[PDB]
Design a protein around this ligand. Structure first.
Ligand SMILES: CN1[C@@H]2CC[C@H]1C[C@@H](N)C2
Ligand SMILES: [Cl-]
Ligand SMILES: [Cl-]
Ligand SMILES: [Cl-]
Ligand SMILES: [Cl-]
Ligand SMILES: [Cl-]
Ligand SMILES: [Mg+2]
Length: 348
């Protein structure tokens, strides 16, 4: 057990191993507080996140367990990894606090687009890395559910990592109105049409790729209905085949109230883009999720010929998510989490 030391950072007690020095506040959503630190064992600048109220309810205790399980599994060059996890507690009986440690991300996509100009070669490389990471995530039957530019870290060398997996977090207020929290979401999840699956993430990649190409948000809707009208103007209104897959009767009646529109010509929307980029966008931005291109199929598209290496696009170890259907008490979720903290093995 390392020695721990205590300090107060903005109204909060932090108790951390001596290896972590020069702690300085950076952020605080409703799920925790974050400090930057120097890790003297590894030489890395790191983010240290102290969870808030991790075991306050069954829903919160299960979310804490879910996040720790997911971060411990993800071992890929284009996905955020877990450097360390710790608690100052010396037993389950005194266990209350969880701290998560990752590499400090110095810039998101948004920061890079504002400070540098990108060529078509940059966009090939950025979208290639998102798809390489998604091939790995989907191979474990994990859905990210919240891909958007603020959830993509990018460095000076244009190297990219996916972060901030969807933990079933987002509230109704957060998704309301003229908000980037909704502009990258597939229409079947935005409107609760049907049981969604991993295809929702490919829609988000199409929206991100379009905005790297034009410099404009693809579907900047002022609300859910405005956004659906922008989507159907580009891709066309649904055919009988998709309408049958929409499980809500009211959702089906509403769509049938809209005048029919054909799919637009994507070469006339993405004026002057690489024809291979136009073709790949037409294969991602398909209304019927059954017919979208997959991450593994997209890596073999000719747009990525300069970067594709089928011997360097790895898949994940199997991931057991049977806990998602399990009914447990707060203290049972808390014990499972404690065991996962004490069994952590750091990366090479
Ligand atoms: C001018 N637009 C702003 C920032 C870049 C671009 C696309 C969206 N992310 C919003
Ligand atoms: Cl230490
Ligand atoms: Cl990482
Ligand atoms: Cl504790
Ligand atoms: Cl964003
Ligand atoms: Cl597993
Ligand atoms: Mg985020």
């Amino acid at each position: 057990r390392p020695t721990f030391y205590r300090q107060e950072l903005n109204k909060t007690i932090w108790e951390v191993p001596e290896r972590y020095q020069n702690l300085s506040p950076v952020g605080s959503g409703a799920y925790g507080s974050v400090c930057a630190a120097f890790d003297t064992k590894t030489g890395h600048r790191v983010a240290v996140k102290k969870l808030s109220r991790p075991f306050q309810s069954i829903i919160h205790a299960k979310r804490t367990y879910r996040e720790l399980r997911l971060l411990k599994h993800m071992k890929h060059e284009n996905v955020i990894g877990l450097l360390d996890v710790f608690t100052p507690a010396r037993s389950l009986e005194e266990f209350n606090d969880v701290y998560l440690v990752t590499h400090l991300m110095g810039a998101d996509l948004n920061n890079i687009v504002k400070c540098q100009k990108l060529t078509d070669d940059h966009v090939q490389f950025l979208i290639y890395q998102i798809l390489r990471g998604l091939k790995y995530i989907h191979s474990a039957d994990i859905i990210h559910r919240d891909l958007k530019p603020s959830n993509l870290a990018v460095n000076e060398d244009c190297e990219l990592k996916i972060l901030d997996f969807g933990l079933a977090r987002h509230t109704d207020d957060e998704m309301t109105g003229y908000v980037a929290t909704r502009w990258y979401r597939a229409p079947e999840i935005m409107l609760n049409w049907m049981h969604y699956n991993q295809t929702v993430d490919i829609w988000s990649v199409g929206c991100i790729m379009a905005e790297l190409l034009t410099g404009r948000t693809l579907f900047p809707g002022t609300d859910h209905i405005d956004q659906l009208k922008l989507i159907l103007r580009l891709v066309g209104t649904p055919g009988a085949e998709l309408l049958k897959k929409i499980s809500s009767e009211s959702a089906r009646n509403y769509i049938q109230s809209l005048a029919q529109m054909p799919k637009m010509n994507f070469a006339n929307v993405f004026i002057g883009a690489n024809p291979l980029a136009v073709d790949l966008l037409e294969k991602m931005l398909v209304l019927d999720s059954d017919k979208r291109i997959t991450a593994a199929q997209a890596l073999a598209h000719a747009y990525f010929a300069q970067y594709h290496d089928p011997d360097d696009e790895p898949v994940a170890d199997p991931y057991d998510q049977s806990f998602e259907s399990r009914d447990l008490l707060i203290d049972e979720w808390k014990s499972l989490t404690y065991d996962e903290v004490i069994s952590f093995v750091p990366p090479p």
